[PDB]
Symmetry: D2
């Protein structure tokens, strides 16, 4: 298949007590799997369309592709953006740390902006720290669903799933507590790597 | 400022009779300029939000940023994707040509899919040929407005503005004639360059 | 204020085992309450914008109003659309029953279409049975979030909340089991009343 | 057919010099016709889906229905909301006038808010004055495309098409001039009628 479901880089309960293993299991094994299958199906459907020269469902197929592929991309990044507390730095350092200070003033300012973007979403969405190739800078973006409200070429560095399935079983409606807890499991080493590789464009 | 309006790589009327110089002038000097101003303003507002520690308008600012920055990105690629008839080969060759055949079956199949995506948009949008870093392939996407219906990390290779301002003065409601004429001025050399730089990340 | 949170027409656990009392409590007391506060706030902000003659945040305010007011409208209808198993006929009758057969072929056909619309949503949304004043017919619509993918003037007759908070604590990712169970508590008398009042405009 | 294209209540050039007959012709004969055909096609497709118990394209069909039906509704109202200058009052009076003063403070405040909503749209959209059945009031809404950013049950009273096809041939990019000119042709008698009939819910 074109797209495949990546395995978690840690045990399902490795992020506890901040993120329950119950959510990690459903989220990865069920939700993420769905996006991979959906993205693959969209490509097969588009291939069939070209073969038969029948593009009647093009609008449907392009949304299916964008939605599912965006879901696959967002979650693939999401898993690696996390690590058991203590297994990674609690604050970004070196080049990443300097870059965050440069584009946000400080780590705290970045955190405040990122958190505000995360909790203010009207509907399903993501809070995302991305590398902007055109502006040569780090910005925060608020994705709607998986595939909306973002410029093409944006390279994700750090993402937070704000869909209700990501926190409801544990935090219920209190999205603020979920975000507060999530900061504890951010793998700043992974974000640093993405930054090093992202800034070549 | 962070973002600047790029000059056209050719005269305003260099794409005639395919795209009128009148549209080129309004499109570049008026429309594209607005996205640059809007993107810069959004960043300035976000900076102010951080200093005052008030993120009440975060939802508005994130959409202003995404909409305007995406407009800026899309049009910047758009201008470079075109060139006077005769300045470049009318068909992709070498690495790009082989990649199109691999991911679409043939050049014609790609054109058919891209055209269908372009003319079927319900509202404003773009037809886009992008490099998918995850699947390591070339896909067609159908953007809504400037910033919707696309996965993060998508690398734009070839884009076609389907907003009404891009063709109405010349083609009126006949979107098909606009797309058909547009193929005549596609700068495959620019697309080939974007493809080469995209494969390396 | 302009908008107020309507009380549930039954006890929080009156819909069990179909919909847990825990969900009913969070859904009504927390989620619905938030839309009421948000809708009132949006109007207050719009009033302030008029007094100060500054409409810089108009885009934000119009979306805040639409999102929150739509949330308020959707949930208000939602609560009334349900009732304890046994409080109303399990199948539409009289005028409503005849109308369903006319516009859908049969009750089963309607259920199938409504269910498909409910379970296929890509993101948050609603499955909705509405009265179309223009075509003078009953149609099914699939709302995105609370305020998207619907024609102005649509009269809601029967709505099903497909946002994850509406079913996750009980049904997890299995949306189909939620929809299936939901049919058991549909208050056809309320729907019949909305239909009668809708036909007269 | 279920939906039919209404004829204009005046000659195509009756709104000049404010709105050219060229736009009126294309807009009504081409654009509006498309929405009617599209809305009818969506219903036929949904009927076929129920017959064969095949709801695979439900997401596509529901968007096609919402988009096209919303376009049909919006334009049907739009045509009647206008009249040759001098054929209708230049300002709302009686019950409508009183209602506007009540919910906006004054006619001028309403105009300012409505105009701001019209010119600030990011993408295609509508500025709309609607009757809110739940709040028992008149509000302004900013529709995105034809079917987004509005609560169910909203009854349109006055609408302004802000899609580029509505003004580009005459006003180019200067949407402000289009809105300013449009106020001259508003048929306040039609809006008054809609208000009288709208407020019964
Ligand atoms: F997910
Ligand atoms: F543009
Ligand atoms: F809700
Ligand atoms: F139109
Ligand atoms: Fe998720
Ligand atoms: Fe453009
Ligand atoms: Fe809900
Ligand atoms: Fe229009």
């Amino acid at each position: 298949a074109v797209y495949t479901l990546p395995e978690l880089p840690y045990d399902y309960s490795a992020l506890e007590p901040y993120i329950s293993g119950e959510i990690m299991e459903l989220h990865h094994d069920k939700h993420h799997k769905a996006y991979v299958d959906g993205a693959n199906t969209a490509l097969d459907k588009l291939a069939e369309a070209r073969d038969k020269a029948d593009f009647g469902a093009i609008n449907k197929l392009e949304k299916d592709l964008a939605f599912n592929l965006a879901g696959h991309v967002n979650h693939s990044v999401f898993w690696k953006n996390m690590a058991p507390k203590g297994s990674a730095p609690e604050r970004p350092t070196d080049e990443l740390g300097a870059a965050i200070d440069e584009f946000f003033g400080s780590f705290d300012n970045m955190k405040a902006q990122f958190t505000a973007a995360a909790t203010g979403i009207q509907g399903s969405g993501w809070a995302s720290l991305v590398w902007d190739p055109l502006g040569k800078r780090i910005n925060t973006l608020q994705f709607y669903d998986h595939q909306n409200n973002l410029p093409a070429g944006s390279i994700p560095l750090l993402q937070l799933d704000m869909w209700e399935h990501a926190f409801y079983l544990q935090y219920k409606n209190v999205k603020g507590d979920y975000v507060k807890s999530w900061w504890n499991v951010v793998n700043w080493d992974d974000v640093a790597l993405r930054f090093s590789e992202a800034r070549v464009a």
